[PDB]
Design an enzyme around this catalytic site. Structure first.
Site, PDB file in Angstrom:
ATOM      1  N   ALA A  88       0.807  -1.186  -0.283  1.00 12.09           N
ATOM      2  CA  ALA A  88       0.052  -0.060   0.095  1.00 12.09           C
ATOM      3  C   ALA A  88       0.514   1.791   0.066  1.00 12.09           C
ATOM      4  O   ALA A  88       0.820   2.614   1.021  1.00 12.09           O
ATOM      5  CB  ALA A  88      -1.195  -0.522   1.411  1.00 12.09           C
ATOM      6  N   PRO A 146       2.441   4.193  -2.006  1.00 15.98           N
ATOM      7  CA  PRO A 146       2.158   5.609  -3.049  1.00 15.98           C
ATOM      8  C   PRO A 146       1.001   4.955  -4.403  1.00 15.98           C
ATOM      9  O   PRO A 146       0.143   5.321  -4.419  1.00 15.98           O
ATOM     10  CB  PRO A 146       2.824   6.688  -2.319  1.00 15.98           C
ATOM     11  CG  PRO A 146       3.466   6.343  -1.868  1.00 15.98           C
ATOM     12  CD  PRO A 146       3.450   5.467  -1.741  1.00 15.98           C
ATOM     13  N   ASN A 165      -1.513  -4.706   3.058  1.00 16.25           N
ATOM     14  CA  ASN A 165       0.251  -4.357   3.750  1.00 16.25           C
ATOM     15  C   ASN A 165       0.503  -4.653   4.767  1.00 16.25           C
ATOM     16  O   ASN A 165      -0.314  -5.057   5.748  1.00 16.25           O
ATOM     17  CB  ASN A 165      -0.151  -2.468   3.604  1.00 16.25           C
ATOM     18  CG  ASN A 165       1.174  -1.895   3.644  1.00 16.25           C
ATOM     19  OD1 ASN A 165       1.358  -0.648   3.049  1.00 16.25           O
ATOM     20  ND2 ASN A 165       2.273  -1.858   5.239  1.00 16.25           N
ATOM     21  N   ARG A 166       1.876  -4.653   5.224  1.00 12.95           N
ATOM     22  CA  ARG A 166       2.389  -5.330   6.343  1.00 12.95           C
ATOM     23  C   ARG A 166       1.501  -4.706   7.001  1.00 12.95           C
ATOM     24  O   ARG A 166       1.436  -3.796   7.182  1.00 12.95           O
ATOM     25  CB  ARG A 166       4.022  -6.003   6.081  1.00 12.95           C
ATOM     26  CG  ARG A 166       4.995  -4.602   6.776  1.00 12.95           C
ATOM     27  CD  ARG A 166       5.774  -4.538   6.702  1.00 12.95           C
ATOM     28  NE  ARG A 166       6.716  -4.581   6.353  1.00 12.95           N
ATOM     29  CZ  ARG A 166       7.748  -5.602   5.670  1.00 12.95           C
ATOM     30  NH1 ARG A 166       8.199  -6.549   6.752  1.00 12.95           N
ATOM     31  NH2 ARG A 166       8.742  -5.586   4.929  1.00 12.95           N
ATOM     32  N   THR A 197       4.014   0.390  11.294  1.00 12.02           N
ATOM     33  CA  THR A 197       2.593   1.847  11.931  1.00 12.02           C
ATOM     34  C   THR A 197       2.002   2.010  10.969  1.00 12.02           C
ATOM     35  O   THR A 197       0.823   1.645  10.866  1.00 12.02           O
ATOM     36  CB  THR A 197       3.770   2.442  12.347  1.00 12.02           C
ATOM     37  OG1 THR A 197       4.994   2.155  12.817  1.00 12.02           O
ATOM     38  CG2 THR A 197       2.974   3.342  13.000  1.00 12.02           C
ATOM     39  N   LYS A 198       2.467   2.463   9.589  1.00 11.82           N
ATOM     40  CA  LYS A 198       1.908   2.891   8.690  1.00 11.82           C
ATOM     41  C   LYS A 198       0.633   1.631   8.095  1.00 11.82           C
ATOM     42  O   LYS A 198      -0.402   2.242   8.119  1.00 11.82           O
ATOM     43  CB  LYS A 198       2.842   3.421   7.321  1.00 11.82           C
ATOM     44  CG  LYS A 198       2.042   3.573   6.060  1.00 11.82           C
ATOM     45  CD  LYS A 198       2.657   3.430   4.750  1.00 11.82           C
ATOM     46  CE  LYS A 198       2.898   1.928   4.177  1.00 11.82           C
ATOM     47  NZ  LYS A 198       3.733   1.637   3.150  1.00 11.82           N
ATOM     48  N   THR A 211       4.356   9.273  -7.626  1.00 11.67           N
ATOM     49  CA  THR A 211       3.774   9.640  -6.451  1.00 11.67           C
ATOM     50  C   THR A 211       3.926   9.101  -5.227  1.00 11.67           C
ATOM     51  O   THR A 211       5.184   8.662  -5.193  1.00 11.67           O
ATOM     52  CB  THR A 211       2.386   8.533  -6.884  1.00 11.67           C
ATOM     53  OG1 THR A 211       2.461   8.228  -7.932  1.00 11.67           O
ATOM     54  CG2 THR A 211       1.286   8.635  -5.892  1.00 11.67           C
ATOM     55  N   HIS A 231      20.913   3.588  -8.832  1.00  6.71           N
ATOM     56  CA  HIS A 231      21.269   3.648  -7.256  1.00  6.71           C
ATOM     57  C   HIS A 231      22.241   2.979  -6.626  1.00  6.71           C
ATOM     58  O   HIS A 231      23.381   3.700  -5.758  1.00  6.71           O
ATOM     59  CB  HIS A 231      20.044   3.201  -7.139  1.00  6.71           C
ATOM     60  CG  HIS A 231      18.904   3.540  -6.418  1.00  6.71           C
ATOM     61  ND1 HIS A 231      17.489   3.531  -6.129  1.00  6.71           N
ATOM     62  CD2 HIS A 231      18.482   5.271  -7.379  1.00  6.71           C
ATOM     63  CE1 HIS A 231      16.227   4.090  -6.057  1.00  6.71           C
ATOM     64  NE2 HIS A 231      17.055   5.541  -6.745  1.00  6.71           N
TER      65      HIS A 231
END
Lengths: 421, 421
Positions: B13, B15, B36-37, B40-41, B155, B219
């Site tokens: 989940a 953005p 979503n795992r 906290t989010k 996003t 990266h």
């Protein structure tokens, strides 16, 4: 006869002349004269000094360490070179190098019976050979001619009798025409400059010092880039910055290629004249403004002259990128401008740089050496300039836009050089 | 059976998942699930959605043209992958690619009897071969596996149920495992992305799309530079910026050399796997973010793969310099951080990039290809990481710092690849 008490006439009243006047007054008790052409600036200074004949200097930043607030009295101010007469024993040309010829031709040498030295404060390649020739023709062969590689400080106005110095140079290269190492004058100059921890490096001849004039290498490729010439000759378009990357300034691979190529060209010419080329990247980094070794390695610096062209260019591009991260980012590109008579002028950059480079190009052709990068930069400038004169009309251009004496200078340089070889 | 009405379970989940959910809801009437795992989010989103099961998206800037204010209902939210069961026919992995294995191993495939496709939204090289292997072992050989080269938008959050999209990508490369050109799913994905003028380019196999994942190239050299690793593992020192030049970020000749060298390494590996290398500079400039041709010429772009190494590096350095004059200048380098239990974590950059690159390095060694730049970047990262764990103590480190499953992933990729060759 003590060299730090010699009556000294400074020709050109730019900010450098104020710093210089303070430096002479602080190293001795000498009569000090000053000249500036009767421009608006010069006239304003002329009136000021007739009331209170003192200049003012403030050291700031780095320079605060060896330059604080100072004041210096001017004993004589003139605005006509025909008045450059009397017991002056040292002339210092603080004017830019492309004006040496016009200036020296106006000095009444017969009325300077005690002249001992002429110092070229911000010399160009060939300046000392040319001055030698002019002096020799006036019967002043005895006079000592000293070329300095650049002016030794970053000095600017705050008005015309007030300056501030941000910074002093690491080292200065100098020489007289005989390749001495330490004449009295050279010792005096070293003493003057030591007051600010500036190194002086004696060279074997005038050209072997002048080859270290950074602006000959750096200004033409940046100032004469298509995008810079467009900003110069179209004063309404957004400002460009001389050292920024495209599209905010000229730095890009093609311009860096011109930088590397112009240094190749000077090597050809210098070598032809019997003088060794400099290591451009070591000069820039170690004698002027350094960048971290994580950007420009010591290997690139020390080996630059043996690197392949593309690697030279890579190194130079990195150098100029690193420089933007002294405040190079702040140098704006100046545009054409009108004077009080509504005549259009070029600003000092590139007008000085074009004259200096055109003189060397004409010299090179006389000596059968080709300088393709110089030639391409000057062809580009000339076409842009012609187009601008047609937009505004030749009648509305100051004569500085329409001719120069580079041809005679080149002939005089060649004549002097050939008379010693 | 109409593909734009298929029940669709989005795993992850971030953005991107909000944008994606809006894009699916706008192209059809489909049941939408989200996972979503229990971070906290995820917990915070879990509570929110239990009250009002709607997400919100705002298009801004460029994206405002095809994305305005939107709302989308979620029909099912889960935080345990063991609950990823029922009549779902499409799974979309919005999680980063180094988590595919852990995620797919937790899905109870027997409880997804109508599964038709699994879409790898931000794939990595080898992701689709690995997913094929896992599916084949679960008797899901029929399921269509689609790799996308990257997520198709920029996003971000504004909270966890609200996102804004700044921009959409020019093109996306995609493929399924059969090298189809236009299966139903692929046509559906093209339709979804067309709503934002995004090009879709079909590739002949999964790896031939994944080779276009920009982050694999860019990266590691920037994120794993000595100076970036120091900023990462010493959270108190001044912040670094991922794309700035030294000393404010890592870009310099050595890091650019790693960039060019790592692309050389992928060519070796891709070629070994039967896949052609990309033209890195054309990909970067023309498929992602362009710079003016006065900085990076079309010649450099079109001919990049045949240019000598040093000229490749010059071109890349110029590219990244030009990019700083999307807001690359703003990307900060994130540091190690503690969680609620005071365990230290690495941030996603470089933790994801290290995992993706370590998997490919282990694959390469299995296949007898050497990747010296990858190896040097990972050796450097590992030594920095060891030093950090000793500073803080292994007991005070989250287990993500102490091990990974890259070894099994590499073995599974090799196994799948060898079974088709």
């Amino acid at each position: 006869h003590m060299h730090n008490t010699l009556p000294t006439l400074i020709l050109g009243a730019g900010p450098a002349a104020i710093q210089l006047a303070v430096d002479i007054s602080a190293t001795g008790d000498a009569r000090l004269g000053l000249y500036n052409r009767p421009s608006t600036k010069g006239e304003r200074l002329k009136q000021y000094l007739a009331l209170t004949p003192t200049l003012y200097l403030q050291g700031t930043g780095k320079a605060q360490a060896t330059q604080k607030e100072s004041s210096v009295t001017i004993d004589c101010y003139i605005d006509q070179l025909a008045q450059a007469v009397g017991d002056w024993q040292r002339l210092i040309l603080a004017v830019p190098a492309d004006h040496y010829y016009a200036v020296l031709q106006q000095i009444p040498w017969a009325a300077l019976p005690q002249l001992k030295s002429v110092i070229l404060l911000s010399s160009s390649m060939g300046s000392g050979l040319m001055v030698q020739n002019l002096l020799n023709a006036a019967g002043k062969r005895d006079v000592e001619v000293i070329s300095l590689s650049s002016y030794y400080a970053d000095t600017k106005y705050i008005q015309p009798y007030r300056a501030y110095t941000k910074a002093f140079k690491q080292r200065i290269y100098l020489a007289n025409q005989w390749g001495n190492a330490g004449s009295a004058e050279m010792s005096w100059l070293t003493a003057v400059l030591a007051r600010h921890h500036i190194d002086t490096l004696p060279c074997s001849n005038l050209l072997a010092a002048e080859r270290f004039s950074i602006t000959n290498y750096v200004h033409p490729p940046l100032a004469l880039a298509d995008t810079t010439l467009q900003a110069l000759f179209y004063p309404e378009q957004r400002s460009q910055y001389l050292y920024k990357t495209q599209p905010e300034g000229p730095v890009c691979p093609a311009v860096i290629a011109d930088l590397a190529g112009l240094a190749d060209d000077y090597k050809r010419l210098l070598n032809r004249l019997g003088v060794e080329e400099i290591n451009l990247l070591r000069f820039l980094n170690d004698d002027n403004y350094p960048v971290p070794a994580s950007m420009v390695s010591r290997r690139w610096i020390d080996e630059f002259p043996q690197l392949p062209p593309l690697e030279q260019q890579y190194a130079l591009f990195v150098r100029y990128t690193a420089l933007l991260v002294y405040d190079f980012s702040a140098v704006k590109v100046a545009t054409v401008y009108q004077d009080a008579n509504a005549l259009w002028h070029l600003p000092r950059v590139p007008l000085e740089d074009v004259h200096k480079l055109r003189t060397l190009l004409l010299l090179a052709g006389a000596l059968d050496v080709v300088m393709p990068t110089a030639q391409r930069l000057l062809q580009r400038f000339q076409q842009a300039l012609k187009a601008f004169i047609d937009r505004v009309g030749e009648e509305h251009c100051h004569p500085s836009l329409l001719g120069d004496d580079c041809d005679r200078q080149a002939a005089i340089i060649e004549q002097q050089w050939r008379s010693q070889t």
